[PDB]
A = this chain, B = another copy of it.
Amino acid sequence: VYAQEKQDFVQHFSQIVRVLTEHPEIGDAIARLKEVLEYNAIGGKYNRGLTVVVAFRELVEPRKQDADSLQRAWTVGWCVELLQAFFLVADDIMDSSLTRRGQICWYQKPGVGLDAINDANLLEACIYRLLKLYCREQPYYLNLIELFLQSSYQTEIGQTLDLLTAPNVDLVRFTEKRYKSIVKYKTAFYSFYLPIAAAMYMAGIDGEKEHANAKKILLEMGEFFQIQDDYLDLFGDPSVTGKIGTDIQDNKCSWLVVQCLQRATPEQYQILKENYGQKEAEKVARVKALYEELDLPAVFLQYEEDSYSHIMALIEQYAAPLPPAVFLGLARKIYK
């Protein structure tokens, strides 16, 4: 689906850039914007953008899929990638990250620094420029502008909650209710709801009820994805994933610590109070081994089965009238 549509998606990028990087004296700014687009919108897996394109094909009767409709699908997928890029560039400055996608974070490059704040705003702005240029005449134009704006806001407000929740190792902040709330707003809305919802609108499916039904399935898939992402940060083999995890060094509200704290005798709370959020490795070793000693690998395994049963019921209940394959194709990318 994705294996076999990733090709035209990445080749489209070059057109995306052409049309955004066309008024003599603004030239130098426009060159900078090109360098920003190139460094930051390229080099991920493109799962979110591609989901737009795949879902567009599944949703539109194939006799309403001319060259220009496809091109709008490619474009809106690239909009989702640009929203991703905006959030990351800015999040990397906020967290003080060193690398991203296997390279030096844009803000850490020589003579970029905090100028990356403007660069990131430009990435966001490019979303609406593309939507104007390619979709202004379409009946779903407004629908999409609102979708992207709301996705930004949800993701922003989730970032606030995350930042309040994890500055300083106060583990009383790290609750289940709070973990779930952070994942929904910061991650799931834009990563899972947004791309399918966009394809929906592009197909004419604008009903509030249809969107709510898809949302219900897709926010739940997003919660599982992040939960598996947190497991793997620590237990994932690093040559299968790519990441090597610093969740624990960074005092993250990770599903692991949440579960751990649900399960600990008061003596264990202490070992964790003493090791959570530390630089030193031995004190990260002894967090791992405390998680191992509470069979969190196994709780996760149980959680993962339960979750899969749940998603399948959701799809059975709430997919109609969309093709269950829209959702199943996504479920297969994450439950693998």
Contact = CB atoms under 8 A, between A and B. Distances in A.
Interface of A: 24-26, 28-30, 32-33, 90, 93-94, 96, 111, 114-115, 117-119, 121-122, 124-125, 128-129, 132, 141-142, 145-146, 149, 152-153, 156-161, 163-165, 167, 177-178, 180-181, 185
Chief secondary structure at chain A's binding surface:
helix
Contacts of A117: 90, 93-94, 117
Given A33-B160, A132-B146, A164-B32, A152 B26 contact: no
A212 to B, nearest CB: 15
A277 to B, nearest CB: 16
Copies in the complex: 2
A122 B159 CA distance: 10
Contacts of A132: 146
B111 A167 contact: yes
A185 B26 contact: yes
A199 B161 CA distance: 36
14 contacts: A26-B185, A28-B161, A28-B164, A29-B158, A29-B161, A90-B117, A93-B114, A94-B115, A94-B117, A115-B163, A122-B156, A122-B160, A125-B152, A128-B146
Given A90-B117, A117-B117, A159-B118, A25 B125 contact: no
A273 B159 CA distance: 45
